Design a protein around this ligand. Structure first.
Ligand SMILES: CC1=CC(=O)O[C@H]1CC(=O)O
Ligand SMILES: CC1=CC(=O)O[C@H]1CC(=O)O
Lengths: 115, 109
């Protein structure tokens, strides 16, 4: 029941591309720092960041090319009020300063749960 | 170690309306229940595309839904790959998924 209610939270999914000049070695380290910085973030229920390890190109369905994505982030917010606490937070603002250093380009998707 | 996770960007067929596509996403989820080798499937619509990013905005075109598969181990992934009900589920995929991008992910934490 926890996992079910968690899954229907406000969720935003991010495609991350590293800065052109940053090494992959450094980008991975900065993703870990960015997760550590998320701990205790006002308003945030959960953050997850993962590397893109593979790009299987052999699809059954026509393949969609979106270029090289380096990591995938995701945030969960338990309510609109909590999302607002996060949006107003100085602590989030400092987290985003770290983001400007190790995220070259970003695509957010606000998702909608179907079930 | 950790579960194998594959994320998917889904674009609906041009022959299909946004509403027809939603309903097929729900069907695809229902079909996945008890899928050999699969730990979990999730599918979500893309409801918003904010551009107020601060870091440079990345344009990947219009993505209609996000799908994700979890497998508890490489042995379960292979059971899934061999399975005839997975193959039938993928035929449903060909019907409601116009274009697809998979990402195999790696945990960091
Ligand atoms: C919201 C976020 C998700 C993520 O991966 O990082 C932050 C965005 C940012 O730091 O600019
Ligand atoms: C694997 C999958 C993820 C997804 O959303 O659908 C299947 C692929 C498919 O049905 O072609």
């Amino acid at each position: 029941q926890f996992e079910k209610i968690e899954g229907r939270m406000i969720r935003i999914l991010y495609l991350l591309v590293k800065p052109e000049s940053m090494s992959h070695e450094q980008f991975r380290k900065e993703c870990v720092v960015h997760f550590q910085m998320s701990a205790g973030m006002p308003g945030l229920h959960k953050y997850e960041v993962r590397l893109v390890a593979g790009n299987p190109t052999d699809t059954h369905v026509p393949y969609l090319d979106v270029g090289r994505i380096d990591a995938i982030g995701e945030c969960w917010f338990a309510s609109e009020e909590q999302y607002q606490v996060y949006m107003e937070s100085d602590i989030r603002k400092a987290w985003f300063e770290h983001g400007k250093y190790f995220i070259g380009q970003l695509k957010p998707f606000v998702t909608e749960e179907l079930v």
